[model samples]
Target: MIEPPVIDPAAVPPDETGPDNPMEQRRVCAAPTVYPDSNFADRPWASDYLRLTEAHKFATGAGITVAVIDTGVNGSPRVPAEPGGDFVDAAGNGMSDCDAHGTLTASVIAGRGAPTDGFIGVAPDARILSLRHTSAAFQPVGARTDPNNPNTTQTAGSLRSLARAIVHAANLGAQVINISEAACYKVTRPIDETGVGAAVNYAVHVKNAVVIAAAGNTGQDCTQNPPPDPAVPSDPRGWQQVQTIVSPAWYSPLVLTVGGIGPTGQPSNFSMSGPWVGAAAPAENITALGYGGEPVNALQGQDGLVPVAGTSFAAAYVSGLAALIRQRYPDLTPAQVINRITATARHPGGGVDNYVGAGVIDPVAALTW
Candidate 1:
């Protein structure tokens, strides 16, 4: 099991490192001044009407740690993650996020926002323990290089890697684990389980960690109600034969699966809908730090922030809110935390539905409740 890094809060400042050595900057532990021109300004106004930010008056996830299990979080001072492992290559020191998705997710959960960059996280004071289970470059494990090609069995298996990461995060003192990637596969027998289900149980039952995952972006009717053609793909994203969102999300009796809602208040076109959806969040055009802190995408004229869209980002929102709730009510169990979030959600038909789960997550409602 990986252990969390010991840090002296006084040793690092909120921002800026010496010019001589710039690769590493200390993590910031304060709320960013949300300016009018901030790149992510529109984010707060959309899904929950920026009410989530006001909840920060009570708690900003101080003293909480979240595990971001994905491609990898880039090495930067703006959003420093604890030293975590790379299950993809079996490397113990996997901190560089090459795929850019990991950093995107990490930024949402706990990044120290930059005013100049116009990006801020939901829980800026929270800490991140990043585990690399995939690759930004998608390095080949066998003969197959790309998992999206839909024609090869030579790619690395992500589900097995996720199982290892789940237990690792719990042991490392993570209160929340965010898996932004879905279980997409080429094999007929989806690589849905090994020890993943059991590890999730241990993380929840024993460690009291809440696990959150993307409900998938395949636009599939995983609820047995489907258009058929758009059902989860067979070879690339979904199993060659399975139509449901893959495991461990599909297998998670213990996991909280989240779907994506666009600006239109409807689930994103690519968001996979199913009975497994726990809730929904704004996934379209979310802004966050770019790999190496480049700030490429730039939505809403915020130069340094990148514009990303997916259920992955939506799940990150829920994960960040979970951290806030954990910090606000330390006594609430993971199950209780889930209940509060779902209970406070914006239901589709003003009630639970297969498409949007409980509905759009209301962070303020969860915190106040």
Candidate 2:
């Protein structure tokens, strides 16, 4: 008999309160400064793949509420997101965007564009529910200490907080939840994911919401797994060789995991492959709303202006498409919504390979199907 997975209490971070809490000590008040001359006049190439004009004829996601669970969102007039909640800092709300990731993700899902700009989101009328669960600038004051160096402390988003954010989003009545963040672990030394797993199940089964997550990028803890042998005719189990397990994305059937594709319609070099990946979307040379400025193609990073590209934004695109589907077919269940998106996708030559899943999501086809 197989034993059920157990939730390790230690895996959840202890709640810290009081004036001396570390989260308060590391609060971020100002949004990151915009990179100079980062705005672009041309429409992003992704707009071509979406065929927005055709898809919008069916539904524009007017009534659906999409919860963007990420770093944070710097609210903008184009995409007016509600201040859902902030798990990173008790004193801070979900409207503060210090890492500059969540704002881009939210904009990709439902940003409204002006007549002068060629940029617009997939579901322009979808309501955004902003929820902050992670940040690159803020760290828990008294969290884990580095084993190698006592003075050096390390802390980041934990599965505990992620679980809480998901539950909160569901309770807040978000029809669709978008998670652009991921936690990776080695197969040999895996950590307890039961908490997050249970939270996802609750959101889908109990709250009746659609969950979308990024399949994950290859770097640091997540390294590229061995590719299948080209000499072999076919290998359906190629995903078994994946060395890293990306949480939420690895949760499979529960989450609609999305991978990244470049301008050539090929799998992104950094996108990690697994059986859980359900769809693919454009991830390179993408343009979206900045924290609080004109549409930008890049972000203001510590080193300099960094081009926006990753499975995170790709997942956002999928979320927007999901919104459109849900609005058009209000009677369809969450499972049916996912099925329409995947079944209507343009499958690869071999059909449903691990790299790009079913294939790039076709918004026009999804809405019609």
Candidate 3:
């Protein structure tokens, strides 16, 4: 069996790598600064707002909500006012986004809204509901998480806690739920018996909302974030719940997987791949903020937008697009929305790698669907 390769966080800061480096920090939303205490003023803002708003899909999502099930969003004055409460175990309060990864994901999909910098989201008017602890209850560092593996870190309240979080998201009225994170490694064989699938089913059955998850970035085929398996049947991304969750580059079936296209309309190397990849979108050199209270432009990775390109970033792009579509066509059920995005996606013909999926997602293009 071929083992999946592991990579270390790069030594270079995003900016030092040059304009085109995949790891260079860039603004994913390139949103303008909004908060008074925030220091993240570097990426293009008004441009992003104009670019996304020109589509005029606001009629669909402004009133709806997208629940995020990753490390709960880092609250900021820049964010929307209807923020949901932390979903980590309430009694213990296990959710605070110590990793900050989930917080970054939220910023891209639904960051602080406009007027004061605005930092245009794909669906600027959409509201965010945070469901803390999708996978872990506490921070990854000392929380028994495997630093070398990047996935095996779960709290004492693992899958049960995650399922509870999903319930909270549904109850909160999230039209779309984004579980930016996924289950840990080495559980493919035991997943059915492990209650993971049950958790997913609960999320789907209880909440009619569409769920979007990240495709893994281990340089292999995965629909949603999961460890790379030696062979195909493993379904690295797990079963498609309504749709297979694709990453910026990873491809997949109904989950509406996506690919990353740079500003130059090119694919990022680090984007993951999969045969099930459904669509593609702009996942490269995106500028986003960090949980530590920093804007995306400060990154010095390979390129320097804000952070590096991975399935996580790709997932956010798709999540944002999905919100826009939902807002424009509120009547469309989650299933219909997934079908429309996949059906309307622009294909580049034949040669599909996990890195670019079907083709770049056009927000305006999806609006008409």
Candidate 4:
């Protein structure tokens, strides 16, 4: 089900108006080259390739790896490039596509399609490391919100496995990690089940990598946690970037909590508000790649690509940018890169708060950061 507000063309913006050069980042953020292979002329694609030289330029994530820890990725019939190999138990057990959610997300950050594909985002040339932790019942919250009722049942989640998995990604040299999941585990409860906080720490702090997480779709206002008055704290479930409930980035300095805004240029009504929010992105029900062929997705419970919603996608977009930044400046610490993102954010007026982190993330602006 596509749900309400079927995306209207008027809602979507035109292609990037950046430097007239289509090869430039204006068209799409570049990813790394197929190392040892023979396709690209550069490492990672650059915002402007004319200025940087081969040996002098950093791989545009050219060879960098990024792992998407979610249900899994389905790369079959639609196109058979192996999409490559991963360490998941089963490759396409129907849970693989589990609704094309992961596929769509992966495509958004680093997908390639015919000239007619109307969807694309930050990094279209990077390699996708698919980490499956989702299933037919991938809906962690099952479209339900209960501050008191926290979902802690991980069909196949194990702290050790997840921890080891993330560490493996880092050790494998993943430039960025994106976990588009949220939970109700506030500081008071255990975080392992939540899978966002602890994993991020291990990845970024221990493994020295960049991690991005979805702020969640509890639908709370980011402006204030627990909504005025009663002020009950929110779940402390860790988000890779920040432990977000009503806040953004507060989870950890290493985290880049993202906010969501609709195509109408406003925050999504269902979005939670809080200081943790660092920046908003084009969240309004946008389209992207989904499981190429699998069905059972997070949406319809079939496995394949399908339309989904939430700030999760927003965070994924930023994760792609982090890959770019990390590739460009491997020496730059995560904190330093976060600073650049904040300093370069296009604050959309009134005091920036949990309501909207540094405003919507701008690909062009962030590149400068």
Largest TM-score belongs to which candidate? Answer: 2
lDDT: the better of candidates 1 and 3: 1
Report the lDDT tens digits of candidate 2 across residue range 95-116.
8787777888899999987887
lDDT per residue as tens, model 1, 1-369: 111112222321111111111122122211112233555434443324546557778778888999988767775666778766766554345576656578777877787765565456778899899887766344443342455543323222455456667777788889998987676542333432546666777788878999998887663323232432335434222122234544555644488888888777887877776546779888885656655543433432246433467788888989999999999899999998888888999887636655577899888778875
Model 4: residues with Cα > 4 Å off, grouped in runs:
1-61, 76-95, 138-164, 186-198, 219-224, 227-250, 293-307
- The most accurate candidate by lDDT is 2
lDDT of each: 0.66, 0.78, 0.50, 0.50
Please provide, for model 4 over 65-143, each residue's C-alpha lDDT reduced to its tens digit, 9 standing for 90 to 100. 6677655666533312223222233333212444346665675566653444333335545677766544333223243
Look at candidate 1 and tell me the lDDT of residue 207: 87
Which pairs of residues collide in model 1?
Answer: 99-136, 234-240
Clashes of each: 2, 0, 47, 53
TM-score-best of 1 and 2: 2
Q: Sorted on lDDT, highest at the top, how do the candidates line up?
A: 2, 1, 3, 4
lDDT score for residue 34 of model 4 = 16
Better of 2 and 4 by lDDT: 2
Ranking by TM-score: 2, 1, 3, 4
Worst 10 residues of 3 by lDDT: 15-24
